[model samples]
Structure formats: C-alpha cells, structure tokens
Target chain A: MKINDDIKELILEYMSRYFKFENDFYKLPGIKFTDANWQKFKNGGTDIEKMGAARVNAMLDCLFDDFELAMIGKAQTNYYNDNSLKMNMPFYTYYDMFKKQQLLKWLKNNRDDVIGGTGRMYTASGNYIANAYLEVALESSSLGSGSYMLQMRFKDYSKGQEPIPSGRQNRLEWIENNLENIR
Target chain B: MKINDDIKELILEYMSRYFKFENDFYKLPGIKFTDANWQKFKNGGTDIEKMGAARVNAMLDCLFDDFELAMIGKAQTNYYNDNSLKMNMPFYTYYDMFKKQQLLKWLKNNRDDVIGGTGRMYTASGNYIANAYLEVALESSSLGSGSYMLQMRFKDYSPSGRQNRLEWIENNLENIR
Candidate 1:
C-alpha cells in the first residue's frame, strides 16, 4: 500500500525528536519526499543528501515493519474459530507458535546445516550466532482439541551463567506493548 | 557529553518531519528524555518505551557521527604543514589515506587472515564480503615533496562481466559529492 501523509508525518516527527543534527542534513536543496527525489538522492545527489536519505530509508523500513506487526496483531483476534489451530489463542502465543513452526521447518530443511547440543541448535551458515531451543507442549485447556503451543528461545551466551534473551523476544515484547497504539 | 535540550528539540523536529507514525510511540507515558527515564526504559519499562529508546539512540549515534565528520571536514583546512604527512591535503584525500593506512596495518597484522588475488584482497573473517584493492601513487605535484595519494577500491562481483562499485565507493562519493 502507498504510504499515506499521516505515516510520513509520524516518521518525520520521530526523526526530529531524536536525530537533531541529522535533521539539518535533510534540508539540503532538492531533497524532497518524492520517489523521484529519493531516486535522485540515491543516484546523483550530494553526499549529505545521500547520507540523509540512507537514514530516512532505514527509519521508513523500520516503521513499515512495525506497522506490519500491528496488522498481524489485529488479525490475530479473528482466528478464534474452533476449526483453527490458533483458536482462542492470544497474539503472543500465536506469534510464538508461528516462529517455532518456521524454525522447525528450517531445521528440517537444513538438517546438515544445523548443529544441535544439549539445549541449543545453531546453523552452520554463520547467519545466526546465538543458541536456540524449542519448547513444544499440549496445553491443558486444549488437550482434548489436539491443539498445542510451540515456543522458541534464542539466547545470548555472552554473559556468563544465565542466558540473556535475544532480540526476537524483545521485538515480540515491543510489538505486544505497541499493538494498541498502532491499531 | 550530555545531550542538551536544543539538540533534543532538533532531533524531535526531524522525527516529526519524516516518522509521523513512530513519533506516537515516543509519546507514551513515562517515556521522557531523561537519563533516569532512559535507564528505566532499558531495564524495566514497557516494550514500546524500550523500542522507542532504541530508535532514539540510533539517531543520536548517527547525528554524532555526522557531527564528527563535519568537524573533520572543517579541520582539513588547517593541516597545511611542511613536515606533517597530511600537509596541504583535502578532506577526502586525507580520509582515503587514513583508510588505506588502516587497511595496510590490518593486512600486516593478519597476513594469514587475508587472501590476495588479481586486483583483489579479502579477509577470511567473513566480516567483509566484497573484493578490495588499493592504489598507491605519487602525483607529479607532490613528487618532490615525497607525498602520495592512497586510493582504495572495493567491488561487488555479483553482477556478471563487470564489477560494480561497492558501498565503500558509494560512501566516499557521498562524502565527496
């Protein structure tokens, strides 16, 4: 969908609130919020304008991702039919199940690429550095319905002893907290 | 350095101009721009607050990096000396030289970590995926002065038949253009 003016204004407002010095870089001549201007900046604009556009694009990508998450959260409430696997499940639970299923599919497809240990599994492709584990369980409430919850945990091993939560969990938490505002 | 209110206001204004939707994320209660608030957000605040702080921090980092580049650009005019290595060089020239020197140092210290081919060299650490090459030349204008320009080229070999200019070149062009 085309980004509306309200979305653009929101992103621009956030940029101003945090990137004080960078805001000036966007003020360069001919750097407008048009596709043609973005193309020009990417292809032949001044150094400062290019740099400013890079930052702007990153913010835009992130904003869109957040919006997608918001939409997912909104759609989750409609999947409560008895025939659906996600019946009566919260957004977070469904999200975890979706991610766990994805991870399982990846593991199945790339069995040779994956290395598994006591409570961890990682890919040999060097794309992921952390340890990951999966939890699969049949919930008491859904035991008779043959429905189950699947959860995945990715941990940061940098800190000694206890494993720290990964960015995925943090992202999930962020999505949960901002879902209402986004809606 | 502590971020003053003026800098904060400028960033907030910039955010308003582009990130119209994201600005609302920052308006949540208790998401103030104070050190205590930041710490609380980082440690135990709502997920939205933590996410907002992450974006704020990224912008702050980029703003500071740009400010540093500007300062470096401003300082280029003062390096005209008879003895110094950077004597009478433009900002881009000095920047290229500095990066070339850094690359040379890295190559020297990690000879085993680097693999060199025709007109290309890359490290084994997998940190850099593109092919890189260095150009060292003495200009006629600076030949007598024992000064030279060091240029580096990084190429993207994904395109067939021709090596596309890498992000390094684009960054330099951005810095230069």
Candidate 2:
C-alpha cells in the first residue's frame, strides 16, 4: 500500500531494532554465536529468541517476494524446522542447507526465518522455507551475488549447478558433519 | 535481511499500487463498495473468472496488509485461512487527507500485500463493495500510470480495512442498536 511516512518510520524502526553480535553474517546457516543465543537459560527471557525468530521470519518473508524459492537433495527437508515457534525455543535448524554448508550446497540468503506457513496458517516448509534460508544464509555465496545458492527451477538444480534447493525433507533430519566449514 | 535491487523493487512496486477512481470519498466505503464479499456469478469466460480471482486475491492481500496490520494495518494480512490460501480482501476510505475529500472508495492503489500472517494479518462487509464496483472505475491510480489495480490480500474479498477498523460496525451489531 501507500508507504506513508509513518509506515516508513515504523518499518525503519523495526529493522534497526536489534543487532546480533554485529554478525552481519550468520557463521552458520542455523547457528549464531551470541551470548544472547542462550538467553532463555538465565531468567527465561525469551525476547531475544523471539526477536531472532521474528527477524529471521520477517527477512525471509520479504526475501520470498523477490526471489523464487527451493531446497536441496531429497524432495523434502526440515530446513525451516528449528525456526518454528512450535518447537519451543531451542529450535534446531530444519534447513539441511545449514547441516551441509559446503560451498556448493546453498541457494540464497534469508533475511529472516519463515516458520509458520504463509503468515501463520501452515508449516513454513515450501518456498517460504527456501526463501528463509536464502534471506539469511544464501546471500554469502561461493558462486556470486547474482546467483542463488539454491535454484528455483528443478531443471536448474538437475543440471548440476547445485542440489535442488528443495532438499530432502524429514522431521528427523539433523545437521550432519558434512556441512561443517572445517576451518 | 539484505535489501537488494529486486527486493527493493518489489517493496517499491507494491508500496505504490491501487485504484484511484474519479469519484468522491463517501461512496468509497459505502455498501456498493465491497469488503470481502464474494459471489460465484457465471461470467463470460472461465479463464477470465479464474484470472480475475487470482488478481483479486492478490490485491485484497495488499489491502489487508495496510489497513489491518496491528503494527501498520497496511499490506499485512496473514496469507491463509482454514487451510486454504487466504484471499480475504477489504475496502477502505482511500483516506485522501491531502485533498480533504470525503474519502471516496477508489481502485487498488499502493499495494505491498507483504505476504501475510506469521507476524501480520481483517474486515468490512461494509459501506460498499468499493474495490470492484465504482462508476468510471480506474485501472490505475494515476493518469498515464501503469495499471496498478491488480493484487491480492488475506486471500479473499477486495481489501477491506483492519478487523479493528470498524468500531462503528461492531457497535451497530450491539443489542442496543
């Protein structure tokens, strides 16, 4: 709609509301190195966790608007699994991209996580998930700024540019050791 | 997280889309103007009908986003309802504060329909089904402007304002009235 001055102000405020350890980039697609990461451990302050989740989700939502979405390997994966509020705080990275962060595996960067499907109706498992990963992690690509770590077209991934951004999805999926940078 | 050219374009594009009809404001929010009112009338072509539905859904999503968002109530309605895609749209007064008009209903204008519900997500069965109905309906909001009237929101209806926007309607529903 009309981006009135008030709306713009609010959006700017929301965007600049918080920062996570000045980590312009997530060291891992699914992990962040911040004392606040362990926020709930102390006085049960979940604000950080909530903001992280919201930031991840908001960025992801906005990202999807611009980029088509996808994942890797299997037909389905829990790429957005850990980001879900339903998982209760210590959400794991459902995104296999994080589990396998080899230079060749990512699709795009997610500005935020898209946990609940389409606003809050369903599971954040489709393009929303793909978009979320892109918003946060996929931006830092081995390929280039113009390229997506994940491909929207099945045809593209099948051609071997990278695994299908729509990775194999399973609730039990975990971040295996293959994804480690090993630095 | 990063605002790129394309993402920036998407924001700018939707942020500036809607219908600007050549009518007064009072008529905009009136009953002839719709607020998510849907009826399956047999139209000339099924293709057009389906396409129209898709476009309408998109526009309404934007209206719901702006008028109903708790934070902004503009282009912020959640995107699904009851398991299916949410196509709930609504109409608004086209609040023309600058002209100080009586707030006539207008065509879709300035839509971001920021893909709803995770953090965003409203209503009127109100004054008029303004979005799809108006004399001399506009295809865009400005003269020589690209057609901007097409988009979706909340999955249904023409974009009505926030569910909380109508204290009057709610009060009307109250027993005393």
Candidate 3:
C-alpha cells in the first residue's frame, strides 16, 4: 500500500480530529467518573487510578513504535452488570498478576475466538468483581495516517488493593460513597 | 495512575518481554506479511503501506502523551470479515476521502458502534476488487495498556492501479519453468 503525499495529507488532517469535553480523560470508552471524586482522585488521594493509568500508557507507548495511548478506568459500577453491547460497553480489569498472565495467554493461544463468553459470565459474580475493574482506556491517532484510530481497552485491576461488600446494592452503595474523598 | 520508579521499572521490563521475531512490526496484533513483500514494502515499491505505517506510528506516538502506538494490518483477507467485540478494541482506516468523512461523522455522532461492516461483504466480489482492495490497514496500542486492539479490518481497495496480471503471470511462469 504505497500512499502518495496527497493521501498522507488527508489522513493527517482527519486523524487529528477529536470531540472535546470537560473531563476529556473521563470520556474514555467504558469509564465514567464522579466529577468531584475525579478531582480528589487526581489530587493524590486515589493514587492507584492515576498510577495505573500513567504506567499502562507508558508501556503501550513503547510497545507501539510511535503512537501514544492514554489509560482510563471504567468509572461506572452499574455498567459492569450488563455484558451485552446493547446496553453496556465491555471492559476488563485483572486484580491478580497470575490472572493477568492467564488472560494474555488465552488471547495469544486463542486468537480465533470471538469476544464475550464464560470469561464475562464468570467475572460478573463473586469476590473477583472488586479486583476486576476497568484498568485502561486508550484513544490514539497520527497525521494523515490513522494507525491509532481505535479506542483500545484492557483489564488490570489488582487484588486486595481495596475491599468492598458483596451484592449488587451493596457494591453500588460502596462505589458511590467510598470511591471519592470524604472531604 | 501514579506509578513509582521501581514499579515503573518492573512494568517496563515486563512490557518489553514479547514473543521473538525478526520484524517487530509483525508483532502487532492482526498484521502479517511475507519476508520479501515486507522487504519491498519497506524499501518503497509501494509507499502507501510504508507511509501509512509511519504516519500511524507518529500519531500514536504523540496521542498517548509520553506513550506511543505501533501500526499493524490484519494479516489475512478473511480476517476482515468478523466485526464483533462490543465495548473494546475499536480502530479505523480511510480508503476514500468520501467514506472517511462518513466515518468521522459516525464516530463524532455515534461512538458506540464497533468496527467493520457491510462495507467488506459488499465488495467481496468481482472487478471492483482492486478498487476494493486494501486502501489502508491500521492497528494501534497504548503503552502497557491495550486500549487499542481488536483488528477491525475493512477493504477499500480501488480498481486500476498499476496493472500486472500479464507480467505477474510471466514472472511466475519463468520461476516455474
């Protein structure tokens, strides 16, 4: 695919385009954040979210030759219950380092399988839920060439970092009251 | 997230740990190429592939702040068929200027849709195949993050570029003979 200068110019002009917003970072696919808590989260109270996002973004930057990707956690707990796209966007977050290894291994081994399966159903319930949160959200692009037009996402929530009670109502209440700084 | 130096160091080391290959470009999800074709492609016979790759790499390199992305085309024609994977891995390529506008409009208006569509099946047959051939292919990644994945491929190959049916066959015959 040998593209000419004209094509290059066109792609560059197009790829740079993006919709604007108040919390551009929060606009990431599958992630929603409470406005005030989002402020505290960025202000060092919730360091894990920031630390993970920056770390993952840095890793992705190097893996790809020239493009950069920003990481955003799926901010909504309610969004997790529905796995189907009709209502919710699918996201993944692995709490255990061992589980992360397993997921990647599965992806490498089974490149042919379609998305949505036992993995979704399995994680929907149980203790694993808290650990598995939206770990990364990325939107990338380049000049006239759109190598990074896709909004790529991943699962990387760690185990034992934070604890919460079980049950849909309990989890929803915890997410609302506990995630943000009390102040 | 605010990662520390030690943690950063560990993650960086782990991130670099990938399956081995001569061309790191091939390591990209969904992209594959023959060695000779890859060589020719790099050297500049067909600059679109190279130009597209380079452009995408640069774009990805910057968009993620300190991180960057790599570009890869889905390795096979058949690979372009499936477009499932809701809630993850959405990517794009523009073959025609007109369609590109359409894509951006859709993205700007409806960001929820997954990549790939009737676009592929519509041109899966006949002379328009050339015109419908790969106008462009792209795959990107955010740092240790996989924010950009799912090789959503589409065919915008156009008809009538430099024709070589006769010559390609002759060259093949020479090799066979």
Candidate 4:
C-alpha cells in the first residue's frame, strides 16, 4: 500500500499506543503482565521479570529507531532473516525471544488496525519497511519453540575484544543528529 | 485466522468467482483481459494468449485442488519454497511464471476479503494450508522478474526418463473417483 499521509499518521499513532506506558515492556497485547503470568514465565520464579523486561525494552527501542529510518528512506539494510529479524543493536546478553503465536497475532492485528487489510503486507518500498518490521518481529518471537525467554551472559572484555557496533542510535539521537539532512 | 463457517463459506464463494468464467485464466484482478493487455504481455504478439491462458488455467486448477485438500485436513505436504510454491503437477512443458507483485497483491486482497485480517497468516495447521497455498501462488507468479511468461518445451521420453509423479489427484477424482 502507498505510504500516504493517512498511513503514516496511522503508523505513528499505533506505535505511540503499542506499549501501555513509556517504560512498560511486558504489556504487549495478549500477554498478561500480572504476577501469575510473570511467575509462569519465570518457570518457577527463577528468571527475574526485571531483566527480561529490560532486554525486550532495549530491543524494541532499537527496532523503533530502525523503523523510523526506514520510513524516511534512509535505511537500506534489510535486517530480516529466516525465523528472526536481527535487532539493530549490539548485545552483551544472550538472545531474548517472544512467543511466535502471540507475537504474530499481535503484529497482524496491529497492522490491520493501522493499515486496514489482511493477507501478507505488500512488498512495495514504503510497505517494505513496515513489512520488514513485521517480519523481524515474527522472527524474534520464537526459535521454533513455544515459550518466550531471556538469557544473559557475561561481557567478554579481553584486549581487542571491542563491543560490536550496531551502527544505529536511539530514535531521539538519530533525529537530533540528522535534523539538517532530514530537513 | 480461525476457520469459522464464515471463512469457509467465503473461501468456497471466492473459489466460485475468482475467474470471470470457467475457462477464463488471465482475468485476475489488476490484470485487464483486453486485446491491448494481451499484446503488451506478448511483447510483439508472437506469444499466443490461448496457450498462456491454458497453462495458467491448468496451474490454477491444480492449486484449487491442493487448497481444497488442505482445508479438509488431508494435505500434509508443504509445497512452499523460498521464491516459489511448487505446483503439485508434472509438466512436459517449461515452467510458466507469473508477475510477483501482481500475483501477491491479488492473493493478499482475496485473502483479506475471505479471511479478514492482515500481516502473515497464522502458522496453525488450518491456516498453514491456506498460507502455504498463498506462498505457492506468490512463488508461481514470478521468477524474481517483472513480466509473466509461459515457455513450452518438447516432452522428453528417453528410456528410464519416466514422468515425475506429483502424488496428488484432481479434487473431483480425490473425492468421487
């Protein structure tokens, strides 16, 4: 579909309401953030919700940035892979995944809510960015498995072991830095 | 999406009306079945619409059969590929491909009209069949190109070169034969 002003406005509006609050990471639709659900997600209260929420929040922050870049026609790199859309951010932690069924249902419902149609999203350049985001979300939600989990590891800080560069910045930073060019 | 009675009815209704007529093949949405469109498709009018239409019609017939099987919980084989969904039929002629963009658009629009929603179809078994059918349609529509073309070739009958079997029967034969 053409990325007309209507679609753009809808996308922005949908993004604004995707999460319940500014820092609410686990409040995705269909996923109850109640104490019981958290306990179930933790598999007997071992996995902490704080860390999982942080990991999802960070990934989402980078995803939103990449999406904005794509909207402005500046991002060309397709981060989509089979079963996952690689976040445009480096990690010192192990991968955190979401439930595939829940994630895809959420993405589809939201896309339809915003764009107003069904089936696969169109692959036009304007639609490609949004479609790519959906593809990424589908991939990151599951590893061909059933549960969503976050696993972290220690950062390797050996000599010449520089942290991987994600080649991306926060959305606000990106806009602030590229104000002249964007204008 | 769930396969409610509404969706099933819609699917059957759509299959009934997809083509303008029983023998009409090039009458898909976004494609004008006019003399002008046919001439443009032929690139010089050398390619006859009759043959191209036959090929497409045959492919669509098999696709509809496969889709019916999937709906009935009988089709288990996944016919999807990275760029094309393999047709469940053997051909003595060359592979005929469709325009990717047009085909995908048609499929998406039809799917929305029938099932009602957007984004990827669910991976549930019921949706899997429908989604797989869509994937095949998308793949069959193009070969990573701009135009849809049909190329026919000689049927090879060399010794030990038996015809490949698709292990699928026609929908009518599958149920009543």
Candidate 5:
C-alpha cells in the first residue's frame, strides 16, 4: 500500500518537527515517496523533519511493508559497508525497510566496518548511533516480535559508547551488521 | 534527594493524567502495596479522591518513589499472569523499566519468597524465563551485552505472549543468562 496524501502531509510535518533538512555534506536528494508532488523547496527551503511523513515516512512504511527481518539484516550489513558518504535517518530507515523486506544477514563479520560505520563518514554520529540501535535490535530478535526493551537497553549501556554523551539516542541503524549471528 | 511533597503531588497528578486508580479485586488489608485505592466512587462515601488531599495522588507518588520501575512491573506481570490483560504500550513501557532495573534473574538454585532483594515476585516458571533471557543477552561478547538487556528483552518478549512467546523470550534469556 501507499502513504496517502494526508499521511504524506503528516509525515512531512512530523519529520520537520524533529529535524531540519540541511544538505551540508552528504546531500540526500529529496524524492516524492508516493504522490510525486512535494519537492525539496530549498536553496531557499530546508524544512527538516524530526519524525515526519510523506517522504521518509512513506519510505519506512514501504520498507516495512515488503520486507522481513532477515532482509533488514543484509541491508544493515550493506550500510555498515557503504563508503560513498554518511547516511541519514530517512536514509537508514528506508535502507532498513528495504533489507527487512528482502531478507539478509546483519553486519557480523566486519569488525573494521563496525568501527567505520560509527564515524568514518559523518562525524555527526547520529546516523551511526541510529544504526547501532538497529544492530543491538538485530541481535535481540530477527522478527522483532519483541526487542523494544533490548534495543532500549543497549541504547544505554554499550561500552564503546564511551565516545557518546549521556542522553544521546543510539541511532538504531548503526548496529546494522554487528550481530553475533542470530540462531 | 528525597522526592519533595510538591514534586510528589505533580507525579500523582501526572499519573492520574494517564490512569485511573482501580481496586476491583479485594486487596488484603496488610499486604505490601495493598492500600487498594479507588479513583471512582465505587465503595466509599464518595470517590476517594473527592475530598482532602487525594490519597491516590499521594500513594501514586509514593509507589513510584522507591519502586519506580518495579511497581509498574509487578502490576503488569500480575495482569499478564492472572487475567492475561493485553494492553501493549503500558506493558512494554513497564517491562522496559523493570528490565532496566536489573529485575531479570534466574532463581539460582532456589528463590526466596519475594524473589530478588527487590520486590520482584516470580514463579519457578518465571525464574526459568529469567534465566532464558540471560542466555540470549549473553549469547556472545558481540551479540549480547551480558548486561541489563536480559531483563529488558525478557520482560518485553515473555509472558502473556502467544503460544511460544514465553519460551521465545525465556529461551533467549536462558541462552544468555
């Protein structure tokens, strides 16, 4: 199914509430998720959404729609390996949706990559942190039948996490491929 | 610092914002946390909170004072065990709080009456489930944190679950702990 115009509007509103759409370094070209009307209204505009709808929102809905848990695993591994540039939440969420829809293993084999995934690209670390969240989540359960609390925990106590501040959220996608192989 | 009376009142107000005090069951008089309150005017001359300082408010603040997470866990667990009440959000939220409090533990050899030094109460089956969560969280130095995630994952996944939900959570816990 597709995110309707109303939901698209809601997604845009929510996303803008959380984040500002600024293309400083890794320019994420905006695209119409379902309706094909909204555009990135800036050089003059950068309405970054915190958790909004339409674009990233639709991508998340679509990603979760067609994928399964295993698919999310493989996509995360790819994100762990992505050398082009640092990604964003909308990007990671969409990427994860793609993986989950398709079924792939997580970032388990690459220690160097996990380190790289953290900060080699965007020093902002928010995206990496989000990925790390997804990593611990992947470690918790494949189906995500119930890992909300587990994800929330590692979000707090991971050791390498000494680099982060006290209350920063562990970006769920950072843990993309760093699992011990779910059995 | 101790929660001051004003903050306590705010907490009570905040809690009432989300939930109504309930005591459908006849809670025993002398039991711990058995002050069985009624937000509605069911069994009293008037609704308990209608006059004076609201006991619901005062007690709600007090319940969260020391126990915090645990208070919610006990409530949710009982709901899970007894009536199989299924409201997803509060269940997940309290379970997370409980897990964060390190309430997830096996009954090593055997458990005392009140379970942990904390007021967590669990059956042999619940203890086994705790152990199961431990196993999952301890899966590997990489896969598991060998830390608080066990309680978190277990509380999130087990009990009042689908057929395999209990085992799903417990087996994972057992795998780690």
Candidate 6:
C-alpha cells in the first residue's frame, strides 16, 4: 500500500525528531518536531506505525541496523505465519516512499547522497568519530529469513571513525557547500 | 603538588559531570550537571588542568581505551625524557585515582559499580544487549607497556546474545558483594 501525504508528513516529521531528540544530534536539518508529533509518535497507535516510525527513525539516526532490526523483528514475529505480512514485502515499499518522498529532497537540495541499495547514508555532516558505521550479516533461521544490519555509532569509544576523516578535500567541499551544520 | 580544594571540588564536580552526562540513565540519583560545568570542562585552560580534565573525561566517556590512548600520547612525548614524568610510574596511579575518586562514588551511590583491577564497569542499568563489558589485553609496541581496553556495546544485532549477556551478569554479580 502507498503511504498517504499526511502519514508521509508524519513520517518525515518523526524522522527529523528521531535525529533531533532520540539520536541527540540536535542540529540536523528540518523543523524541530512538535510535542503533538512526539506524543503521537511515542504513542505509535498501530504495530505498523510503531515499526514504521522505528524504521524511518533508525534510517535518520544513522542506526541503519535498527532498520534491519525492525525488519528482523517483524520477520521473526511472522516467520511461522505465512499469511501475516512478510516484513520483506512492506519494507521495500516504505523505503521506496522514504527515498522518493523524503530523501530525494536532500538530493535535490544537494545536502546528502542517498547511496541506493547499499544503505550508505552519506551526508554533508560527516565528522562522526568512533564506531560511526557498522555492517553485520546474520544467517537465516528459515528460508528467506536472512538479515543484514548497518548502523552508525552515535556515541564515543572508537574502533573506526565514519568516513575515516582523512579525505580533507572532500570534507572541505561539503563544509563549503553548507557551513551551518556540516557535523 | 596535591590537588587543592577548589581543583578538588572542580574535579569532583567534573567527575560527577562525566558520569551524569556520559551515562544517559539520568534517573539514577546524585547531583545533576549544569551547562556552566560543561562549558568549564570544554574550556579547560591550564596544561595540567586540561590533561586532568581530559583524563577524567576520558574515564567517564566509558572510553577506558581513550584513557590508555591519552596516557600513551603523554608517555610517547616523554619517551626519551628522563626527568619528565615516567608513564610507567603514574599510569596506574591516575587510573587508581579515577577508580577510587570518581568511579567508586558511583558504586558507593546507588547507580553503577566500577569494578577495580579487572576493569569491568558493571552498571545496574541492564539493557545492554551484546558484548556489554569487553576487556581486551593489549601489549605496547615496546613489549613492556602492556594495557587493557574496556568497552561496552549497548545495543544488539547479534548472533548469540544469550551467553554474552548472561556471562556479563555473572561478571557483574561476581563483584556485587
């Protein structure tokens, strides 16, 4: 099913809020999420909305693994039940809507590059140090139940820095592009 | 020179800040940190104060590795200097001070337990899913300067969360009494 404009807006607002509040990367783009939006989000009325909010929020928070987790969680719940919605089916559709409706704005604004299919969310704000990006692969318990986790470490303690902080020239270009909050 | 009362108070204040801000489970009791303290910490002016602030800050960031890195960074600078502070002499002292002066208070308080010697920072807040407390033994390049790295993975996307999680609990309660 296609995401409606209102739900689309709600998702976008929640996406922004997730980054702003939950991730504690307060200076990210978009209007600060409202109390009403937050209350609605925290009280995610439906299972799909809760998962949807969680999934979209994870993508924004650079917790790509949480996206995977949400999918995995949904998948695991319905693993035995074939009639219950396959997490795989709706996942792509929501992500597609997220890509077309929300992320494309960043591409249009020249703010971020949505790495198609690979899930490498390359943004202009690029100084994330310490466990910034992590990739994990999991074996399938059943047929078509495999999962991969990609995540950003928002906290300190470094195994690796995001984007390796060495490409001075490219980083400088992003800095020049947007001086306000290039992370 | 010994740490003066003001600096000691400042250290205590920042020590509290380190735990308060670093550990996001703010509902745990004790004095709360303010913006003034954070600004003061960021603008650590004097050299010793800066290093002291950094050392303490590193400890609280749950970055025992960074604490080692900072010590190593300081140690490498004085590698050739004889009269200068010896890395080997004082590394454990500061860590001990950190454990006693800073971490012990949290343990003494109702929040988290800072396991001494073994370096297993076990917290009462038990939502950590995979690889909660990891202590890695690392030998310095010169053979003698051995170190340990302690870290926590607060989330999960794991192959086996059961053993890691359970063993961590066993470890935590090992020092519980």
Instruction: Provide the RMSD of all predictions against the true structure, rounded to 1 decimal.
Output: 23.4, 21.0, 20.4, 22.5, 18.7, 24.6
The CAPRI quality class of candidate 2 comes to: incorrect
* TM-score comparison, 1 vs 2, better candidate: 2
Per-residue lDDT tens digits of candidate 4, residues A1-183? 111222223323333333223223333332225656644533434222222322322222223322222122111111122123435431101011212222234335442221111112222122322212212221221212321111111112235433333332332233223223321
- Candidate 1 vs candidate 4, TM-score winner: 1
lDDT of 3 by residue, B138-163 (tens): 12221122222222222222222223
- Cα error, residue A66 of model 4, in Å, equals 17
DockQ of each two-chain model: 0.01, 0.04, 0.07, 0.03, 0.01, 0.01
If you score just chain A, what TM-score does every candidate get? 0.24, 0.21, 0.20, 0.17, 0.24, 0.26
Question: Candidate 4: lDDT of B45?
Answer: 41
List ranges where model 1 is wrong by over 4 Å. A1-87, A117-183, B1-17, B20-177
Q: Write candidate 5's Cα lDDT for B1-86 as tens digits.
A: 11122223433333332223322111212111234343222333242222222233224322232123223323343335534344
Across A119-164, the per-residue lDDT of candidate 5 in tens digits comes to: 1112122342132222233332222233222111122234444343
Instruction: Summarize candidate 2's per-residue lDDT along A34-88 as a digit string, tens digits.
Output: 5564333223343222233223324333323212212211101232232453353
Distance from true position, residue A63, model 3, in Å? 11
Residue A89 deviation, candidate 1, in Å?
A: 2.8
**lDDT, candidate 3, at A145:** 29
Q: How accurate is candidate 1 locally (lDDT)?
A: 0.32
For residue A153, give model 4's deviation from the true position in Å: 24
Clashing pairs in 4: A83-A139, A84-A139, A118-B117, A118-B118, B84-B139, B98-B141
Local accuracy by lDDT, each model:
0.32, 0.24, 0.27, 0.25, 0.29, 0.31
Fnat, model by model in order, equals 0.00, 0.01, 0.09, 0.00, 0.00, 0.00
